[model samples]
Target: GPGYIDTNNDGWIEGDELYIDTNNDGWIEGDELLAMQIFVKTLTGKTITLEVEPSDTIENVKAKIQDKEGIPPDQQRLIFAGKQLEDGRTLSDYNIQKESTLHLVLRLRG
Candidate 1:
């Protein structure tokens, strides 16, 4: 279960790229086209980098991030740098291309 969209058309999208057209020549290359980045953040502040394509969305990022933190999916928000993020918003919308850093904020309990 994954959503794929390359708003910037960088020929590479992040996460779950088992069946993606990397060359954009309209043909399946091989199983080696899994383009994605792994992020590691903590309550204090830190970041880890990895290979990530441009097609990944904030929703996917947030979901993967949930694995690190012990919070539910709906309990967190994705903020890119200083910009608050909303679902369905592409990375390019925030000028994120091949490499970009996003911020995560835990919402106060209501």
Candidate 2:
């Protein structure tokens, strides 16, 4: 299992445990560190869960989705709270929270 925050040292990070690894440095510092899982729903009603940090940009999230679903990042469109998530923006910028469900709408090829 990947490294995650286990404040209780209970051998599990769950139910409010945060996993913050910005920069992938394997270290956490300051209040900027926090990780939570969110759901990505496809057009077919399928849901994919992802563990992400608020500091992660939309682009970064898309890349992960591509790795999981084999859908190219450019072909994926993420929407949260009725607004489209754009590149160069972090999840915090959109106020995304734990267990948030983001709708994934594929871009039609032209």
Candidate 3:
């Protein structure tokens, strides 16, 4: 009786929406929810506040940055909480929070 639905029909059940066996998983996990936002800055002083979910991975953000800043994901370096962000791990895996600032630096190759 109490659940969420794909109101917009966008195929995504978004925030507060019910998890209607979308993936057919018996149990629901945090990744099933919507992502929050966080602020990120570049070494060149470019800053962008992105709407992200903890379930989003660093690579996901890198792709966004690549589009916005024109920096390739391969060359991007994301750092948060004084540590480099990993591609495979979701943002929720880190200590990131709302309004948190993440660093973006282009990797320099020898």
Candidate 4:
């Protein structure tokens, strides 16, 4: 049940190899279960990129953005695929991709 073919035979069964379980649980499938790169766009035309795990909460992602852009976490409203990313939800809940782009707007209250 072992000796899973590395499709590309590159030693590692990732980045191109599929049809084999990288996790090695005896199932033959690809889950893309790896860290993802999320690209963010600000209304001001600045682009920000962050590496995130599927288990990372949206709030955590916002914090990373805040760290890089110097914007308060509370001031950001993140939207992806036309839906707002909820604070408590993880990126996996949205099935986000490696290069998925998220649009963020600044919400300033009076």
Best by lDDT: 2
What TM-score would every model get versus the actual structure? 0.54, 0.72, 0.65, 0.69
Candidate 4's TM-score = 0.69
Judging by TM-score against the true structure, name the best candidate: 2
**Residue-wise lDDT of candidate 4 within 23-102, one digit each (tens)?**
45666544533545679998896787776778889899989888888888899999999998888998889988767899
* Model 1 whole-model lDDT (C-alpha atoms): 0.58
Clashes of 1: 3
Ranking by TM-score: 2, 4, 3, 1
- Choose 3 or 4, whichever is better by lDDT: 4
RMSD per candidate (Å) reads 9.2, 4.2, 8.4, 7.8
Please provide, for model 1 over 25-97, each residue's C-alpha lDDT reduced to its tens digit, 9 standing for 90 to 100. Answer: 6555454255544453444557744344556666766676666555666877866667777777656666664
Give the alpha-carbon lDDT of every model: 0.58, 0.81, 0.73, 0.76
lDDT of 3 by residue, 1-110 (tens): 12466668898878746443324456445664454557888888667867666677888989888887788999998888789888798887797765688998788886
Model 1: lowest-lDDT 10 consecutive positions: 31-40
Give the residue spans of candidate 2 off by over 4 A: 1-14, 17-33
How close to the true structure is residue 88 of candidate 1, measured as C-alpha lDDT? 78
